[PDB]
Amino acid sequence: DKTVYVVLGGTSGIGAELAKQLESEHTIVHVASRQTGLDISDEKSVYHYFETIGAFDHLIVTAGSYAPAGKVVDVEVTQAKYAFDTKFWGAVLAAKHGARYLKQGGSITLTSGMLSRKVVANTYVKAAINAAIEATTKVLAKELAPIRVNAISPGEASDIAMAYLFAIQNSYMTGTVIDVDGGALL
Amino acid sequence: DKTVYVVLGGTSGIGAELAKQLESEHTIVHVASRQTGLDISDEKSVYHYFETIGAFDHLIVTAGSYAPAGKVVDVEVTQAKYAFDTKFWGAVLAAKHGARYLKQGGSITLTSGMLSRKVVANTYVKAAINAAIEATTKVLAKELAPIRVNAISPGLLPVGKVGEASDIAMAYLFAIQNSYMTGTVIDVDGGALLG
Amino acid sequence: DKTVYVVLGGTSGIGAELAKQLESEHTIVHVASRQTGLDISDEKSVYHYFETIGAFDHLIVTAGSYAPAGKVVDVEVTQAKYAFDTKFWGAVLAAKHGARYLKQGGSITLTSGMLSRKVVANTYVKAAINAAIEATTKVLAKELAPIRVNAISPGLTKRDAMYQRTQSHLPVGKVGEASDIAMAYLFAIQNSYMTGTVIDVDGGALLG
Amino acid sequence: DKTVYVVLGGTSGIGAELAKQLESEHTIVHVASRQTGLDISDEKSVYHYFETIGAFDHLIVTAYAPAGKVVDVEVTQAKYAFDTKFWGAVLAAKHGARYLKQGGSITLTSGMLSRKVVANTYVKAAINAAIEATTKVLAKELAPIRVNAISPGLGEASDIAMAYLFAIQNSYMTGTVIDVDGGALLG
Numbered sequence: 001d002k003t004v005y006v007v008l009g010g011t012s013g014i015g016a017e018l019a020k021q022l023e024s025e026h027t028i029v030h031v032a033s034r035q036t037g038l039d040i041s042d043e044k045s046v047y048h049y050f051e052t053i054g055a056f057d058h059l060i061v062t063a064g065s066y067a068p069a070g071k072v073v074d075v076e077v078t079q080a081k082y083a084f085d086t087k088f089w090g091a092v093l094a095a096k097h098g099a100r101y102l103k104q105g106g107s108i109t110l111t112s113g114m115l116s117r118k119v120v121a122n123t124y125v126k127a128a129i130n131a132a133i134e135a136t137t138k139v140l141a142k143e144l145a146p147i148r149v150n151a152i153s154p155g156e157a158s159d160i161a162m163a164y165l166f167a168i169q170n171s172y173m174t175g176t177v178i179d180v181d182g183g184a185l186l
Numbered sequence: 187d188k189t190v191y192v193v194l195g196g197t198s199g200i201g202a203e204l205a206k207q208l209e210s211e212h213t214i215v216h217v218a219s220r221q222t223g224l225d226i227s228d229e230k231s232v233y234h235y236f237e238t239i240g241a242f243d244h245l246i247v248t249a250g251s252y253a254p255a256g257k258v259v260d261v262e263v264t265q266a267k268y269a270f271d272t273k274f275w276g277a278v279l280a281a282k283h284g285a286r287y288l289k290q291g292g293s294i295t296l297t298s299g300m301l302s303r304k305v306v307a308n309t310y311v312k313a314a315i316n317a318a319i320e321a322t323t324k325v326l327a328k329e330l331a332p333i334r335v336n337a338i339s340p341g342l343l344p345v346g347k348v349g350e351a352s353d354i355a356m357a358y359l360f361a362i363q364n365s366y367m368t369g370t371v372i373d374v375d376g377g378a379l380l381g
Numbered sequence: 382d383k384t385v386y387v388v389l390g391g392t393s394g395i396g397a398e399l400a401k402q403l404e405s406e407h408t409i410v411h412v413a414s415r416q417t418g419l420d421i422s423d424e425k426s427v428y429h430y431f432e433t434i435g436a437f438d439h440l441i442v443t444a445g446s447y448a449p450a451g452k453v454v455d456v457e458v459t460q461a462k463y464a465f466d467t468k469f470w471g472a473v474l475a476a477k478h479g480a481r482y483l484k485q486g487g488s489i490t491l492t493s494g495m496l497s498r499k500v501v502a503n504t505y506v507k508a509a510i511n512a513a514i515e516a517t518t519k520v521l522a523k524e525l526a527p528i529r530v531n532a533i534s535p536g537l538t539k540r541d542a543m544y545q546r547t548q549s550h551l552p553v554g555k556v557g558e559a560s561d562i563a564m565a566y567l568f569a570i571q572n573s574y575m576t577g578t579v580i581d582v583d584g585g586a587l588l589g
Numbered sequence: 590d591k592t593v594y595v596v597l598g599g600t601s602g603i604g605a606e607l608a609k610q611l612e613s614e615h616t617i618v619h620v621a622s623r624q625t626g627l628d629i630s631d632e633k634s635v636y637h638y639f640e641t642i643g644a645f646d647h648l649i650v651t652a653y654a655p656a657g658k659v660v661d662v663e664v665t666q667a668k669y670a671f672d673t674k675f676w677g678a679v680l681a682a683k684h685g686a687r688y689l690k691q692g693g694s695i696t697l698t699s700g701m702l703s704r705k706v707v708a709n710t711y712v713k714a715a716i717n718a719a720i721e722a723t724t725k726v727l728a729k730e731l732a733p734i735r736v737n738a739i740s741p742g743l744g745e746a747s748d749i750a751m752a753y754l755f756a757i758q759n760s761y762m763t764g765t766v767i768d769v770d771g772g773a774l775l776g
Contacts, residue, residue, distance in 0.1 A: 043263060071329045072278060072322065073285045077229060081275065088314075089263065096259050116321060119369070119775045124325040128274075131321035132314040135302060136258070139310040142588045143257050145552035159574030166568045172536075172561035174552050175305070175588045176581040183576040186523045186706045305588045328775045344732035344763050353761035360755045366748035369775045370768040377763040380500045380729045381589045424664060452730045453723070454683050458632060458676065465671075469715070470664065477660050497722060500764070505726040509675070512722035513715040516703060517659070520711040524658045577706070 004056035004103075005029045005168075008040055008094055009063030014111075017157040018060065018164050030056075033063060040064075040090035047097045058168050059098045059108045061091045067125040080125045088129045088136075095140055099147065107148040109167045110137050114155045114181040134177050141175030148174040155181020190214045190242035190289075194280055195249030197221045200297075200340065203351040204246065204358050216242070219249060226250070226276035233283050243292045244362050245284045247277045250297075253311040266311045273297075274315045274322075281326055285333065293334040293368075295361045296323050300341045300375040320371050327369030334368035336361040341375025349376055385409045385437035385484075389475055390444030392416050395492070395538065398559035399441065399566050411437070414444065421445070421471035428478050439570050440479045440489045442472045448506040461506045469510045469517075476521055480528065488529040488576075490569045491518055495536045495583040515579050522577035529576035531569040535562045536583025552585030593617045593645035593690075597681055598652035600624045603698070606746040607649065607753050619645075622652065629677035636684045646693045647757050648685045650678050654712040667712045675716045675723075682727055686734065694735040694763075696756045697724050701742045701770040721766050728764030735763035742770030 005022050009015040010031035022029045030053055032038040039045040040063045064087025068079035091110050099108070115123050116130035134151055141149035150167045154160050163180045167173065179185060189212060196205040196217030208215045216239055218224040225231045226249050250273025254265040277296050284294065301309050302316030320337055327335040338357045342348055357374045361367060373379060386403050390396040391412030403410045411434055413419040420426040421444045445468025449460040472491050479489070496504050497511030515532055522530035537547055538557035548556050565582045569575060581587060594611050598604040599620030611618045619642055621627040628634045629652050654670035655662050678697050685695070702710050703717030721738055728736035737756040741749050752769045756762060768774060 072326055073282050073329070075282075077275065077279065077282070080278070084270075089267065092258060092266070092310075093263065096263070099259055119324045119328055121325065121329050124278075124322050124329075127321040127325055128318040131317040135313040135317035136310050138305045138588055139307065139313050140258055141552060141585055142305055143259075143307050143310075145585065146554045148553065156574060159572055162568070162572050163575075166564070170561060170564055170582060172553060172555070172557050172584050173565075173582050174585040176583075178580065179578040180572065180575050181578075182574045183522055183526065186519060186577045324775060327772060331772060334772075341761075344729060345735065345761055346733045347761070349761045353759060356755070356759055357762075360751070364748055364751050364755075364769060366742075366744045366771045367752075367769050368772045370770075372767065373765040374759060374762050375765075376761045377728060377732065377735075380725060380764045453679060453727055454686050454730075456683075458680065458683070461679070462676065470668070473659060473667070473711075474664065477664070480660050500725045500729055502726065502730050505679075505723050505730075508722040508726055509719040512703075512718040516714040516718035517711050519706045520708065520714050521659055523706055524660075524708050524711075 003027045005058045005060065006053060006056050006098065007031045007060045007062065008038065009033055009061060011035045013062065013065070014154070014157055014160045015062040018161040021161055021165065040094060041085040043093050046093040050097050050101055053101065055101050055103055057103050057106045059094065059102065060164055061094050062111045063087070063090055067129070069122045071122060072124050075125065083125050084129055088132050091133055092136060099144055102147050105171070107150070107168055108140065109164050110151045112151045112153045112177065114153055114179065114184050116153065118185050137177065138175045145174065150174060151177045153177050153179045153181065155184035188212055188214050190216070191244050191246065192216045192218070192239060192242055192284070194224070194226055194247045195219050199248065200351055200354045201248040204248070204355040207355055207359065226280060227271040229279055232279045236283050236287055239287065241287050241289055243289050245280065245288065245294045246358055247280045248297045249273070250276050253315065255308050257308060258310050261311065269311050270315060274318050277319055278322065285330060288333055293336070293362060294326065295358055296337040298337045298339045298371060300339055300373065300378050302339065304379055304381065323371065324369045331368065334365065336367060336369070337371045339371050339373045339375065341378040344377030344380060347376065349374065383407055383409050385411070386439050386441065387411045387434060387437050387479065388441045388443065389419070389421055390414050390442065394443065394446065395535065395559055395562050396441070396443040399563035402560070402563055402567065421475060422466040424474050427474045431479050431482055434482065436482050436484055438484050438487045440475065440483065441566055442475050442490070443492045444468065445471050448510065451503050453505050456506065464506050465510055469513050472514060473517065480525060483528050486573065488531070488570055489521065489525070490566055491532040493532050493534045493579065495534055495581065495586050497534065499587050518579065519577045526576065529573070531575055531577070532579045533562065533565045533569065534579050534581045534583065536586040538562055552588060555584065557582070557584060591615050591617050594647045594649065595619045595621070595642055595645055595685070596649045596651065597627070597629055598622050598650065602651065603741070603746055603749045604651040607651070607750040610747070610750050610754065629681060630672040632680055635680045639685050639688055642688065644688050644690055646690050648681060648689065648695045649753055650681050650696070651698045652677050654716065656709050658709055659711050662712065670712050671716060675719050678720060679723065686731060689734050692760065694737070694757055695727065695731070696753055697738045699738045699740045699766060701740055701768065701774050703740065705774050724766065725764045732763065737762060737764065738766045740766050740768050740770065742773040744771045
């Protein structure tokens with residue numbers, strides 16, 4: 001049939017841009033988010049979503065933009081956990097319930113961020129989330145093989161989107177994190 | 187004029203061995219854990235605990251031992267989150283509320299684990315927790331300067347033995363005594379990371 | 382005008398595959414190696430080459446592939462230094478003398494390899510070289526901005542039983558195809574927001 | 590009966606400080622370098638040196654590099670720095686290993702620049718990256734001989750020395766790189 005893509009968080013930002021570049025006559029591109037009635041942080045909602053989608057080829061997760069900023073000593077832990085619930089656990093749930101529907105040659109592309117490795121004050125929540133995502137990405141790449149699992153690590157929306165396509169298209173890549181940060185890590 | 191230590195999870199395992207070694211004519215060593223009525227995953231408890239301790243010199247967190255093993259697709263997420271609450275958020279809470287009482291020249295030493303970097307099937311909860319601790323360790327180190335913050339990353343082999351508690355404890359003592367070290371992660375894994 | 386590519390080591394292997402994919406009617410693809418009279422380990426030979434080419438857009442270095450296998454205690458140091466001279470110092474010489482000729486929006490893409498981080502007995506020369514390449518990539522990326530500098534880090538790429546032995550252990554289930562690796566170069570070349578990065582394409586070998 | 594230490598680069602700086610801390614009634618501490626006539630970048634010279642030492646327990650290598658942009662630095666100078674620090678370490682490990690007693694170790698020196706990206710420092714960065722990668726292969730090949738690296742920043746010499754001592758004393762540590770950079774890696 002057609003190659004089916006699922007872009008969670010793909011209603012806006014990078015997600016939307018990627019969805020646009022994926023739209024063709026030979027593909028089906030599902031996008032979902034809080035806007036479309038998917039709470040990626042809620043397991044039953046995530047399970048529901050993938051039940052309505054069925055078998056597809058490539059899963060992309062970009063959801064999770066908010067996080068409380070400030071020093072560890074100041075930042076409210078409840079807000080921090082709420083940040084974790086969406087960007088980290090959201091990805092975990094997505095992989096957990098999406099995986100069984102991936103067709104042969106399928107892939108999962110998660111999203112971390114440079115803050116996983118660039119040490120910046122005020123950003124422990126984002127750094128912790130991203131570091132966890134990158135560790136989980138590699139365990140998944142191992143457990144789910146031959147299903148490929150990679151992460152894009154952002155620092156133009158089209159240049160970021162290009163990295164996802166590359167993850168989706170390269171059949172020899174798995175368990176890797178691709179930095180697209182315009183040299184912020186330097 | 188004694189140097190004061192707090193070891194969270196210092197009632198057993200690495201913490202207990204480290205607490206013994208820290209005991210001396212010039213030190214006071216407070217140990218706390220579930221056994222002593224401290225729930226490190228609860229902010230109220232942790233906030234109150236440090237209230238009773240007052241100003242001290244070195245904080246060491248070794249607590250949070252359990253995590254549900256298994257594939258990502260199999261592991262119950264609530265259990266995963268619960269493990270996160272204790273080891274990771276426990277360390278965050280300890281640092282968040284412990285930092286205020288640290289005397290000048292003091293330090294915080296956290297515990298991660300080799301699984302943060304050694305990719306092993308069925309260990310995504312520990313891998314994620316440890317990776318998170320190490321990233322947070324470095325942020326803390328930057329924000330708390332001149333207070334030093336480091337992490338010890340224990341392993342279970344090239345060395346031909348399994349790690350003794352005193353070998354791990356030695357790493358903590360090194361972090362505590364070396365005042366030119368902050369924001370580092372000290373591996374003591376018997377070479378397991380070499381795979 | 383036409384976009385100009387220089388692929389050092391592009392007369393065979395990964396480089397040859399990449400040169401074929403870059404080949405088109407609106408591009409100019411220069412390939413060179415020992416076969417074409419370029420000794421990338423010899424500074425005056427590298428200087429000569431870029432004088433003949435002049436201004437161009439993208440430099441890709443895949444040159445140098447041999448290194449003595451074995452333990453540190455056994456490997457003849459003189460052979461190690463020779464391998465270093467080609468793959469590492471060759472890349473340094475290519476960037477040093479090629480840089481001034483890169484047009485606006487140009488880039489440099491070097492080649493390391495998984496052995497920079499996958500710890501494998503008997504491979505210290507390759508590991509050392511690749512670790513050196515990747516550290517140098519990032520310093521370059523910083524000194525040459527806005528010229529972009531990145532590095533591709535391939536795993537095993539396509540006796541028959543050795544391939545079967547590998548495939549079985551690789552998460553992807555197959556051994557690298559030359560074009561799988563070349564795709565990564567094309568991505569580094571086309572992505573104007575990527576610099577200072579190392580791109581792993583190793584079929585999951587780094588996972589252990 | 591005593592424990593024997595060899596510190597290449599031990600006549601000054603970190604090496605000298607470490608040698609001071611290792612000296613005691615129950616140890617023997619050999620120090621060597623250019624100052625004592627040892628040329629660590631010369632294979633024959635390193636080989637012969639260990640002949641004079643014989644069996645021992647712990648080798649420590651703490652043994653300049655041209656600063657400048659990659660486009661500016663003279664490559665023969667860059668190669669000369671590599672000869673002394675990287676290949677010097679390789680030669681020390683290569684010819685000193687067979688002499689190491691049971692429970693012995695090798696501790697090399699890299700530096701934060703292997704991982705802190707700084708303009709004008711490509712030679713040091715490349716050297717320290719090479720060291721840290723070679724360190725881990727060695728730790729794997731030489732097991733159960735332990736092999737670690739100390740990575741200093743641009744600090745107090747005794748604090749750096751403490752890191753070496755820690756590497757030497759911990760029997761459960763091999764293939765690791767210990768940062769004692771005073772927070773410089775944090776940026």
